[PDB]
């Protein structure tokens, strides 16, 4: 089988699927929805011509003459195996296309074994004889225009997609945009959808290492396709809401505990530009007490020792006296 590496594509994958010539288009490890918007490292194209009945053998986990002794696919195959009928073109008849039936062992996945070695199924060690019990392993396709269903010629091109092998230059179109840093954006940096802010990475990477797989198997390292710089992927800033309430018959005053984020980061870590105008009073406070589990915004710090009414994290309590955010006495 012929092998081609394809490196630079900016054009789309829309011609893959979406045509009636492509009759069989089962994609195992990827969806056809992902074809239009993806970005990958390497593209390999494998091409051969088979019969119609052995179309089902070219799959993960399938067996036969072709899948054992001619062409092997792995079980975790990411890509699309394509089959289409070619009855007019290859069948004139013509017997020039061959296949391998006899081999000593089954083939490894994506491994090519070209040989004209006589298979030893007989007692004698005969060499170079095309006769009885010296089996020549190559047999010919008997293609005629009188072929039945499953015995007509079919043409196959197999596309495989790879990760963490090459600098990513093979990926489809979006809106023409330039890079910004130090702000929270939907980055598509080598074309993957996600939200994060990237800095320059201090890691030294070999040039086959393009992406990264962490302990949760997400992308944590990435390299630019134009400049050969290295950057890491983390998402934007986090925080939480824990509301201080008395009973609703008493008062409608509240305060917010923020659970562990420093108070200069908490206007930035919340989406305060798109927030409700009530809550940004409760995000930037005049009396803000930083403690171990963050800081409480929307109440007043007093020093005086009161017994606890509302049990609140990191040694603070609240009481209705206005609501005071006091270090609790014990």
């Amino acid at each position: 089988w012929n092998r081609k590496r394809i490196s630079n594509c900016v054009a789309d994958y829309s011609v893959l699927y979406n045509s009636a010539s492509f009759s069989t288009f089962k994609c195992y490890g990827v969806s056809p929805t992902k074809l239009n918007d993806l970005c990958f490292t390497n593209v390999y194209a494998d091409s051969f011509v088979i019969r119609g009945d052995e179309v089902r053998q070219i799959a993960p986990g399938q067996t036969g003459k072709i899948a054992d002794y001619n062409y092997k696919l792995p079980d975790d195959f990411t890509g699309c195996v394509i089959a289409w009928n070619s009855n007019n073109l290859d069948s004139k008849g013509n017997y020039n296309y061959l296949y391998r039936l006899f081999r000593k062992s089954n083939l490894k996945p994506f491994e090519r074994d070209i040989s004209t070695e006589i298979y030893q199924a007989g007692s004698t060690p005969c060499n170079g004889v095309e006769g009885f019990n010296c089996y020549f392993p190559l047999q010919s396709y008997g293609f005629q225009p009188t072929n039945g269903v499953g015995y007509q010629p079919y043409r196959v091109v197999v596309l495989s997609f790879e990760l963490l092998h090459a600098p990513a230059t093979v990926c489809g179109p979006k809106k023409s945009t330039n890079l910004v840093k130090n702000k929270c954006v939907n980055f598509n940096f080598n074309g993957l959808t996600g939200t994060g802010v990237l800095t320059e990475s201090n890691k030294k990477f070999l040039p086959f290492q393009q992406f990264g797989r962490d302990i949760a198997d997400t992308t944590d390292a990435v390299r630019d396709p134009q400049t050969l710089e290295i950057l890491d992927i983390t998402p934007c800033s986090f925080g939480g809401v824990s509301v201080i309430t008395p009973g609703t018959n008493t008062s409608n005053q509240v305060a917010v505990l923020y659970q562990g984020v420093n108070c200069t980061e908490v206007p930035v870590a919340i989406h305060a530009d798109q927030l409700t105008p009530t809550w940004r009073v409760y995000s930037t406070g005049s009396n803000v007490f930083q403690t171990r589990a963050g800081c409480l915004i929307g109440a007043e710090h007093v020093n005086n020792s009161y017994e606890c009414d509302i049990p609140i994290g990191a040694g603070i309590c609240a009481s209705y006296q206005s609501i005071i955010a006091y270090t609790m006495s014990l």
Epitope: N2, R3, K4, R5, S7, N96, F110, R112, I114, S115
Partner: antibody, heavy 120, light 111 residues
């Protein structure tokens, strides 16, 4: 550092046979495939055949089958392309050229070459 | 029947660009390789793929494969570039696997 060392120069008579060798060291020789390329003075590089050392399977060019007796021995890690029945057009320099471990088979290391002379 | 065709010679000024091509019918469906042989020594590979280069040889040498051409580009031509260059398209060749070499380009510097 992968290096390929060939033998000394050859002086011959027509109709004889050669024992051109290419010794390799520092790397696992049996896993990696070896091609032989000849070059006459004034001509381009000409592919002669391909050889797998561990399996022993040899493929040859369409004009050169039968005449060419590419063999190997892993006891002393030396290949031997023993061409037979020498003729006057077979005067060239012989290069042992390894294809790559990766597929599509780029030639990555060569030898310095040895020169054969065919005259009466 | 597939045979590689290469032009005989090309001459450039030093410090300028050079255009050396090896292109035939449907060469874009196959892989192209490039090599450098100096006069009297062993050949060295300088381009590994359609565009990718190995180590040692800098970013002076670049190329691309599209359609019916595969053109090597040499930038800031120096004295050391005067050698022999060959394209090495692999082909199935009617199920007799061949390593087809080109006819050879001789690049000469001026001055």
């Amino acid at each position: 550092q992968v290096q390929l060392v060939q033998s000394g120069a050859e002086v011959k008579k027509p109709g004889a046979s050669v024992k051109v060798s290419c010794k390799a060291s520092g790397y696992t020789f049996s896993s990696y495939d070896i091609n032989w390329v000849r070059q006459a003075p004034g001509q381009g590089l000409e592919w002669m055949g391909w050889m797998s050392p561990n399996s022993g399977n040899t493929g040859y060019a369409q004009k050169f089958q039968g005449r060419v007796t590419m063999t190997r021995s892993t006891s002393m890690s030396t290949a031997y392309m023993e061409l037979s029945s020498l003729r006057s057009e077979d005067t060239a320099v012989y290069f042992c050229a390894r294809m790559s471990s990766s597929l599509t088979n780029y030639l990555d290391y060569w030898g310095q070459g040895t020169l054969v002379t065919v005259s009466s | 029947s597939y045979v590689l065709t290469q032009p005989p010679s090309v001459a450039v000024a030093p410090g300028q660009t050079a255009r050396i091509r090896c292109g035939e019918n449907d060469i874009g469906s196959k892989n192209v390789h490039w090599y450098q042989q100096k006069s009297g020594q062993a050949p060295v590979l300088v381009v590994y793929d359609d565009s990718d280069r190995p180590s040692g040889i800098p970013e002076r040498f670049s190329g691309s494969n599209s359609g019916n051409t595969a053109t090597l580009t040499i930038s800031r031509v120096e004295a050391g570039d005067e050698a022999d260059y060959y394209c090495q398209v692999w082909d199935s060749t009617g199920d007799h696997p061949d390593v087809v070499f080109g006819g050879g380009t001789k690049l000469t510097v001026l001055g």
